[PDB]
Amino acid sequence: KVWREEKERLLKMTLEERRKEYLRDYIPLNSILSWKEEMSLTEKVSLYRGDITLLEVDAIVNAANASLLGGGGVDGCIHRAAGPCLLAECRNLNGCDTGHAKITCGYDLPAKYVIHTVGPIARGHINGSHKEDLANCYKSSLKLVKENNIRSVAFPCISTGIYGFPNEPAAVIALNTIKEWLAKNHHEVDRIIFCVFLEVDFKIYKKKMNEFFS
């Protein structure tokens, strides 16, 4: 396929059209409970343990590397699930800086768009620069959400695992950045989903959601 043509074709389609073609089973957005439903901004956030590539949302966020060509963790899962047009569109973007984001079509994903953001790498202790770059990943991703009329978006645990950002301080920055953005922009979205894969991340976000959104 030619990514520009496949992109034009997919972005015209309704969910009813897209569902007829889906490769895999999918998770409809109305099957994802709000934090409030699970118990005011509690209606605009979700905590979801599972596979971000199954989510039928306007955008999923990829914890990408500077090349944007794919890799391991959720990045590799997103490339396999989207198919080779995602790598082709990513190639054309010529990389992405730490704390910045770029948007592509989702191709074979149920997600309409992928927002690729490059988390900071902490080989040692997290420092002021790592902390501001991780915040900027969330902010640069949310700027693309607003600019592209994305009403549902799912975030993974950016910079955790091999990039070495400890899971608890990472969650605090993620939750803090989404809360300040929603305070100003809550009208622009129906749902921000924190899509965690690991139990350690689930347990951390579960304890914090009320502190931030209640």
Point out the annotated binding site.
Answer: 50-52, 63-65, 70-75, 158-164, 197
Residue 165 token pair: 């950002």
Which of 152, 158, 117 lies closest to 43, judged by CA?
152
Cα 143 to the chain's mean position, in Å?
13
37 contacts: CB under 8 Å, gap ≥ 6: 43
DSSP-H helix ranges across the chain? 3-11, 15-21, 35-38, 73-82, 84-93, 128-147, 167-185, 199-213
Give the whole-angstrom CA distance, residue 66 versus residue 120: 10
Name the DSSP class of 94: T
Q: Which residues are annotated as a binding site for substrate?
A: 50-52, 63-65, 70-75, 158-164, 197
Q: DSSP 3-state assignment of 154? A: strand
